[PDB]
């Protein structure tokens, strides 16, 4: 994933 | 508001590491990848890895899997990035950069750190 | 093994013209990002997801791209405008930079 926390992935 | 502080500048001779330091704060450290960038002086971005504090878990590019090795620590939301056998082309500004709130574009930026390899 | 290639390196636009910078790719990918940067500072986030301008961009810049490419545009140029601009993009596993356009006045 390009990050965390996010809900894209 | 969200802070990056880095370590001071430093000299290395060739084959020495060097480890940089970047603290954190007006964030929750834990929630957010800490990236890793570099850019000689007068060059382009290099993206180094990150790492996500709250397991340790380290991604890195392969140009500098071999030599990179990034950490965090917890307790003083302090992230850190070694890079070992230092060339005189190791040269350069060092980053470490987190990503915007709701999007994964790297809004926050460290002063950077510069490092000189050199005899 | 997604190499983002960014034309022309340099120009240089007289104010008030219009200027498209370039970031080409190997392969068809999306989710573009851009940034700005001047000298002895950080980059500044400056687009994300390919047309959606950072929070405190002037909207004269207007980002854009499909496929294999895909373009930062400056419709009528300012003097603050001057500097050198990044693309950004990830591909599994590792994000990757573009080598960079600078920016300078013409007068």
């Known amino acids: 994933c390009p990050g965390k926390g996010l809900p894209s992935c | 508001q969200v802070q990056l502080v880095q370590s001071g500048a430093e000299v290395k001779k060739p084959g020495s590491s060097v480890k940089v330091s970047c603290k954190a704060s007006?964030?929750?450290?834990?929630?957010?990848?800490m990236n890793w960038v570099r850019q000689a002086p007068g060059q382009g971005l290099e993206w180094m890895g990150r790492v996500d504090p709250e397991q340790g878990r380290a991604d890195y590019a392969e140009k500098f899997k071999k030599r990179v090795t990034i950490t965090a620590d917890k307790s003083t939301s302090t992230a850190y990035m070694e890079l070992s056998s230092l060339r005189s082309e190791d040269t350069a500004v060092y980053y470490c950069?987190?990503?915007?709130?709701?999007?994964?574009?790297?809004?926050?930026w460290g002063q950077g750190t510069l490092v000189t390899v050199s005899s | 093994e997604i190499v983002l290639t960014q034309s022309p390196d340099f120009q240089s636009v007289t104010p008030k013209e219009k200027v498209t910078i370039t970031c080409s790719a190997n392969?068809?990918?999306?989710?573009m990002y851009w940034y700005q940067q001047k000298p002895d500072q950080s980059p500044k986030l400056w687009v994300h997801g390919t047309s959606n301008l950072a929070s405190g961009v002037p909207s004269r810049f207007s980002g854009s791209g499909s496929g294999t490419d895909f373009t930062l545009t400056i419709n009528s140029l300012e003097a603050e405008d001057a500097a050198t601009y990044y693309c950004h993009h990830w591909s599994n596993t590792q994000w990757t930079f573009g080598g960079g356009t600078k920016v300078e006045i013409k007068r």
């Open positions: 950069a987190r990503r915007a709130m709701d999007n994964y574009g790297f809004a926050y």
């Open positions: 007006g964030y929750t450290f834990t929630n957010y990848f």
């Open positions: 392969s068809a990918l999306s989710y």
